[PDB]
Chain A
Amino acid sequence: EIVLTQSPATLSLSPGETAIISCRTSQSGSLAWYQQRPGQAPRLVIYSGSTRAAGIPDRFSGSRWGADYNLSISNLESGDFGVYYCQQYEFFGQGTKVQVDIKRTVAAPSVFIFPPSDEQLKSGTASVVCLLNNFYPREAKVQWKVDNALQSGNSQESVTEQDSKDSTYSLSSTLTLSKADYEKHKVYACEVTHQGLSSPVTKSFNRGEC
């Protein structure tokens, strides 16, 4: 079989910059690149290493040095973002996600914590939610503590797309416990680490307090 290895995994850029992504292949052959826009079908961009497909602007160019191929996209446009795959014969790379990140000044998260609802508690489960609102850059760490005991394996986390207008991100983490375990403890804390913070920030509440 042919193995194709792409790098990097993820590329974060602003429109107008140029994207450069690589494919290493395990044998000489005709190598093509495909672009997948979010929720769209892949489209052929370049084939045989450096030949552009129909309707592809010269901003896209591919080059080759032995087993190593580069695909460069100059002057990135909104429509150039997505994931790119290299392909030889029956085989594909694992893909490179080229995504938009626009720089702004660092903005610390605003942290809010929400206890389980009475409605949810009527029914065996308790979800605790911690919100990190409007921060930049994207990298942020959330840790759950119950009575100062570090939690793990019982939370899930989700991040929004970078805001169009203010360029911030937001993150929502959920700690899920059985109602029973939940009523075995008092202090539920969300601890947040971020570049905008001089030091970690904790939002806490005590079970059963109004």
Chain B
Amino acid sequence: QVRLSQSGGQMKKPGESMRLSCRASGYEFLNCPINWIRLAPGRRPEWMGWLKPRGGAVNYARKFQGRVTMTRDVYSDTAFLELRSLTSDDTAVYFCTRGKYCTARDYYNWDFEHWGRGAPVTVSSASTKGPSVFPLAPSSKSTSGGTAALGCLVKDYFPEPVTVSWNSGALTSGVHTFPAVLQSSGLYSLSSVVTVPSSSLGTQTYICNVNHKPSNTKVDKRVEPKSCD
């Protein structure tokens, strides 16, 4: 069983450098070149280059020449990718790959049978930040005759992700938690909403549960109808 094992995802600021590692098993490391390929969501995949574990010969794509360095450690069957002077355009999932045909005698590099699970790298000038949670209270402007709507606005946090639940998971029906959006500020914002019988507003109590592990912050905001005298 041929396999490629990758190091985890990283968070960088612009200007910094990163090292990713790819470790092989199930075959003789020295026989095949190893490739690095980045996939930015919604953009064309970019082959960055290959490295030959035997010899350390290297070949980089023209756009990365001067800023990237590939190396291996034959003691551990590990290949390394280092990228310098990072910018937001370097945000992507970084994969290592290996060709399909590989024996002790020959190989062929370009049919990528074997991929690592990928290392997600985000380059942003933002620093990790716990969100602010705001009530999206129900009213007459959210009561459609018999069924109402309420929610929570989870604003200005970084990085992804946050988890949101209602009544500690008790409430799940009619709940829509939306995909976060990225703001000019470089910070994320998302909303979670749930529709319920306007009849219940009076009795039933609704609480949204927001957890943002990266900043180790956990908030429970109660969402109720605004009191009008």
Seen from chain A, the residues whose Cβ lies within 8 Å of a Cβ on chain B are 30, 32, 34, 36, 41-44, 47-48, 53-54, 85, 87-95, 110, 112-117, 119-120, 127, 129, 131, 133, 156-160, 170, 172, 174, 176, 203-205, 210
Contacts and interface: CB of A to CB of B under 8 A. Distances in A.
Nearest to A88: B110
Contacts of A159: 178-179
Given A129-B136, A160-B177, A160-B179, 9 more contacts: A32-B112, A47-B100, A112-B141, A117-B153, A119-B134, A129-B153, A156-B183, A172-B178, A204-B141
A89 to B, nearest CB: 6
From A42, A95, A210, residue with most partner B Cβ within 10 Å: A42
A47 B109 CA distance: 12
Contacts of B111: 30, 32, 44, 47-48
Interface in B130-172: 132, 134-137, 141-142, 144, 147, 149, 151, 153, 155
Contacts of A112: 141-142, 144, 149
A157 B44 contact: no
A89 B137 contact: no
A41 B112 contact: no
Interface of A is mostly: strand
B226 A210 contact: yes
Given A95-B44, A172-B191, A133 B141 contact: no
Contact of B193 (A36, A87, A172): A172
B222 to A, nearest CB: 11
A120 B44 CA distance: 39
7 shortest interchain CB distances as A-B pairs: A92-B45, A112-B142, A210-B228, A117-B134, A112-B149, A94-B44, A156-B181
Contacts of A32: 110-112
